[PDB]
Design an enzyme around this catalytic site. Sequence first.
Site, PDB file in Angstrom:
ATOM      1  N   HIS A 754       7.201  31.097  53.897  1.00 33.83           N
ATOM      2  CA  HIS A 754       6.277  31.099  52.770  1.00 33.83           C
ATOM      3  C   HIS A 754       4.969  30.455  53.201  1.00 33.83           C
ATOM      4  CE1 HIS A 754       9.119  32.493  49.691  1.00 33.83           C
ATOM      5  NE2 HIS A 754      10.017  31.817  50.385  1.00 33.83           N
ATOM      6  N   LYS A 763      11.956  30.269  40.636  1.00 38.77           N
ATOM      7  CA  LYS A 763      13.061  31.161  40.320  1.00 38.77           C
ATOM      8  C   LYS A 763      13.743  30.807  39.000  1.00 38.77           C
ATOM      9  CE  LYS A 763      17.181  32.932  42.900  1.00 38.77           C
ATOM     10  NZ  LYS A 763      17.808  33.324  41.603  1.00 38.77           N
ATOM     11  N   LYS A 780      12.785  29.293  55.639  1.00 43.13           N
ATOM     12  CA  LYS A 780      14.190  29.369  55.286  1.00 43.13           C
ATOM     13  C   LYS A 780      15.033  28.874  56.453  1.00 43.13           C
ATOM     14  CE  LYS A 780      17.588  32.657  53.540  1.00 43.13           C
ATOM     15  NZ  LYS A 780      17.521  31.946  52.237  1.00 43.13           N
ATOM     16  N   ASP A 827      40.985  23.643  30.141  1.00 41.24           N
ATOM     17  CA  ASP A 827      41.719  24.889  30.268  1.00 41.24           C
ATOM     18  C   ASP A 827      41.208  25.650  31.487  1.00 41.24           C
ATOM     19  OD1 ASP A 827      43.256  27.162  29.861  1.00 41.24           O
ATOM     20  OD2 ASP A 827      42.624  27.450  27.784  1.00 41.24           O
ATOM     21  N   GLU A 920      46.857  21.735  32.376  1.00 39.90           N
ATOM     22  CA  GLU A 920      48.087  22.507  32.401  1.00 39.90           C
ATOM     23  C   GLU A 920      48.926  22.104  33.601  1.00 39.90           C
ATOM     24  OE1 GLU A 920      45.193  25.269  32.186  1.00 39.90           O
ATOM     25  OE2 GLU A 920      46.284  26.813  31.063  1.00 39.90           O
ATOM     26  N   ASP A1167      39.904  30.180  24.508  1.00 41.33           N
ATOM     27  CA  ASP A1167      39.885  29.234  25.619  1.00 41.33           C
ATOM     28  C   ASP A1167      39.662  27.807  25.121  1.00 41.33           C
ATOM     29  OD1 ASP A1167      40.442  31.008  27.663  1.00 41.33           O
ATOM     30  OD2 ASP A1167      38.330  31.450  28.078  1.00 41.33           O
TER      31      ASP A1167
END
Length: 1213
Positions: A754, A763, A780, A827, A920, A1167
């Site tokens: 860049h 973004k 990058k 959950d 659970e 849920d």
Amino acid sequence: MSKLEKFTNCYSLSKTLRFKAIPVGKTQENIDNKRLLVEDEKRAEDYKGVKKLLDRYYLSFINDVLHSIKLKNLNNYISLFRKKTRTEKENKELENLEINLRKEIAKAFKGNEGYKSLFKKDIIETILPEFLDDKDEIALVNSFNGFTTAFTGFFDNRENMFSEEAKSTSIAFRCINENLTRYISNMDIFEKVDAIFDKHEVQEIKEKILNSDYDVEDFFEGEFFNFVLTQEGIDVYNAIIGGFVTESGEKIKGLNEYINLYNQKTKQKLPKFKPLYKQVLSDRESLSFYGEGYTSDEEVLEVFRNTLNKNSEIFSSIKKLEKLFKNFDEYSSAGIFVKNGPAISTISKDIFGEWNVIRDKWNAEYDDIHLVTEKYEDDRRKSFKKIGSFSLEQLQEYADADLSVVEKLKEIIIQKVDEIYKVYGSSEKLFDADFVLEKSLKKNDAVVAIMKDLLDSVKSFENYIKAFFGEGKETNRDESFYGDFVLAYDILLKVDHIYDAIRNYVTQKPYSKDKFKLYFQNPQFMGGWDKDKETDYRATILRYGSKYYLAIMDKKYAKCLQKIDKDDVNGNYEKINYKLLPGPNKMLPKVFFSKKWMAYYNPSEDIQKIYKNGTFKKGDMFNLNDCHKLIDFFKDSISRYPKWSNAYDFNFSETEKYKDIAGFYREVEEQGYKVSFESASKKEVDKLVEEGKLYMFQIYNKDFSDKSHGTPNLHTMYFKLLFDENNHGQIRLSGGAELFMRRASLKKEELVVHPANSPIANKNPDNPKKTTTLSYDVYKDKRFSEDQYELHIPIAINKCPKNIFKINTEVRVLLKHDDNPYVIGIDRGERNLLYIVVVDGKGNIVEQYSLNEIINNFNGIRIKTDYHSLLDKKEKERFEARQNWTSIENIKELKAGYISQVVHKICELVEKYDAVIALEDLNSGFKNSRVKVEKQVYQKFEKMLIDKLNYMVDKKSNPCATGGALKGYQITNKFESFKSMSTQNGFIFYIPAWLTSKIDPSTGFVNLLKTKYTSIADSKKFISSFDRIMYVPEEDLFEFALDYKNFSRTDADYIKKWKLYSYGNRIRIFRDWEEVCLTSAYKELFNKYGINYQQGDIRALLCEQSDKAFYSSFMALMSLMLQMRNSITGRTDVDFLISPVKNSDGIFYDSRNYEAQENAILPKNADANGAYNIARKVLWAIGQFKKAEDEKLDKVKIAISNKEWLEYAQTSV
RNA sequence: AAUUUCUACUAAGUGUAGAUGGAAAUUAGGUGCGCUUGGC
DNA sequence: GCCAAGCGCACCTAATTTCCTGGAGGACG
DNA sequence: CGTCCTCCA
Ligand SMILES: [Mg+2]
Ligand code: NA
């Protein structure tokens, strides 16, 4: 006080901090000139080589012991193991026989006289060379003479193989706990399934797999298990079970294949055998043949062009098979056959659109002759199974007026040949003699797509062709067709090895160099940090301001930092002075009973007799009065031992108070640690780096940048705290640090850039600053574009814990006396990856939300990240990559990324509400069947949560505050393994999941009816068991009054009496979905059968029906009505929970009325309902702790029964 | 689109927020494709 | 079109072991 | 004896 703060300083744990090491000044050039990095890179390769030569020895050693072992305890263990009624004392004897069986294996190794020398320098110096023959292999081993310390860890890894303990890396564990358990389970399956195998098949396994030296049954008797201790026997045994592939490609069937065939033939379901796991350290070579593959891009391109150009034989074989089919009429349709099986399914689909159509037409003509229906369909299936083949003429019978089978076939072959040509036009340049590829095949997606598209079309053609071979044994068969067709088919089949081998090469990951360890020509480089070992390890730490440095003395100058004094005037580095007295229980006897020390200080026979005899240690020979006189002998020797006496300012206890010797060793251990800094002249130290006598790296991460200004990483805080005066041993610096070189793996020029002064798009859609413009380029993956040193620093937390209690017990106690304990219920799922509900001690919902998206607010800015969407994408990218032979990207980093945010939210929740966590109790067999759904986050979530709760730090807290970095919370037990976990891990409770979601939260109602349609009479009995079934005009609903005691296996229900209504809609799932309006569907069904559904109570009227379809459609509607959870697959917008029962005020619970409300009193969806009721099932467990005395809290069962749960749920309201 | 490393960023300009137990060893699993024989 | 048993190959993921040591002691010029 | 690598628990 809170419950969390009772949980600091409970147990010790180790962690590793990681840093970039930046060379300072001339160090890099001096390292360059001496070629240190080249030496270390070569050493790593040679090190792996020597490690392989050693295994070749260890394996030969293993196999000679194991081949000569006859297990004594064996027959007694197998007997007791197969007992089906064992008393508790028999269970104990079983465990003892299991232990003894492993001790039998461990002693057969460790009873060897030379066993000990397998893990000292003798194995490199002497043993392995005498064992080897190759001059070059022997010289490789010799190159590590004087360097065998570099193998200390590897020797531990090999030692582990010979442990007697039930530990996963042990040979004994593999033999007895794992393979003997499967072998015994297989013996039972053999006795059940034995009869299914006919004489021929048992003989075939005997001849081709057992070398005719054994009967198959022998490997299912207890005495034969010793055959199976070495890879050799394991291979034979797994081949009995699974068969093998011969050099010619014939797949010889194993027992499991014969079981499957029998099952599939009789519609039975007999159990299959399990194969044995591998022998530890075995070099496995398969018993099945598999051809040689390709080893280079050039070889692949040459094979691809020799075998697939227009003039290649395989192409010509297609141009024959085409011209042949294209002239079908010169051959008699009565003589060309389609084998019955997959071949008729293929041909059925290509011509009639569906695989089953030809079987269907055949069935119709069968019925025309033969017209109880359970035998009929089966007798008819048998008669159809007796047919081996189907001619082309016979098939034309089934064609319809417009259809002509032969003409339809030759269209299909033109359609597939034109598809082949089509792909050739795109493969033009790839066949050129002058073509050479820029990119490597394992990085060249464009070339591989051309190759795979061509190969695929040829495969598609080949599978169609193969259906025309028929059985072959046909008498009518037209050999003027077969003869040439078989010549061309046989040459086409050569595309099978080509396709496989090209996929096997082209899909390989390209080679990527690993980082490698730096030694600076020291076999014990940087072994530890103690001052009195600086000369041996040649690495220390320096501080100048806020910056830290690693300092390494050259092999020739180990003393160069010992000399340097303060520069009173100019600036100075601070050089660490680190002293550690590790493991006093071992080190103290070793130092003060050494020949060096016993010269200086002679023991009394009093002193000498104890340590020889052992009356100082609690046990069977214990004698308190001796420890005291020994503690003082040690204490009096510490005074005369200067390197310890002046390193630690000791302050022991009055000896008369030690209960055993360990009470002494613990005080030495805690006080045997001190870290300070002395001044060193920065001029002289700098000149040392200049002259090349000293190497200097800055220990760096981004928080040490001159431009850093935010909250540092937790690890940066840990590291700086190592040297903070307020750290009194909560976090110690450990030995065993390591330094590595990671060669750059990207070229700078090849990086996404860049450029300065061109705006960059932000973004984050909730970010009002849409653009950012910097004055410098940003690259990058910049860090991978230059060589990087990395420093790995071990640390130890809570080395001397003072808060030793059973953590679980303390939680139960604290819950008992807590007036209002909060629960975080969680959950686990895949529609919602995680869903959170927080309740108070009375079960009110305090918070509820899904965690598919992570909401973070910082600086006024909001950010939402839909990780469920991101993982979904990654999961699909990977599926497509797998099918396309393109690059398979990782998913685990993205999972970890997501999970870290989840765990951070949960920790905040734990601190805000002093809450415990409800999950659970998912058995591990459920958690593996969902690994195929690569959104799967169940277990990684658990690991990272449990890890963080081993030492939970609020990064923002004051480091000396409770919950800060020096006083982290430990509210889960130390993670050793999943293996060994119970249903409570400190603050985490695992409860039975049963009916936590499919339950009406406002009534407690659950569906305990069995409503699968089975028969007319059962449907009549079901309808008749309701107290009333009637239409309700004033509500436009159907009412179904039931008393659960009239129905099968409904005992768990507490309320028993319910009125069900046809209220709202349902989503029916079938193969797709449709919405159903229940009232309107009931009206449709009753109208379809002339039923007058207005006639008050209607169940007698319904039982007057004779049509099976009525009773079947009626049971289906009942199921939809009792289906409270409703959703569309792969969908956010539908997951609602709706109840066919009214609450006390006469309203139906409908989660969609709460999904609207921002602050809902009841679950917002199914849920949420699950997380809510998981939490309440723990609230019940807290109720049990309150019912019990403290003395007995450890024995309170926390698993609510199904009957206690329905009562609890149906009386909460 | 910068990192000890990872995820998400640009967060006010060479970085921001959260997480982060490394190393070695052993072993097992899942997906996908091909082949063999079979079942709706 | 879907699926089972088994063989093979490619890939990525992950469970569970161990160490996280200074000072005595030996081998060697 | 001084130095460097191995060994102990
Ligand atoms: Mg920061
Ligand atoms: Na597989």
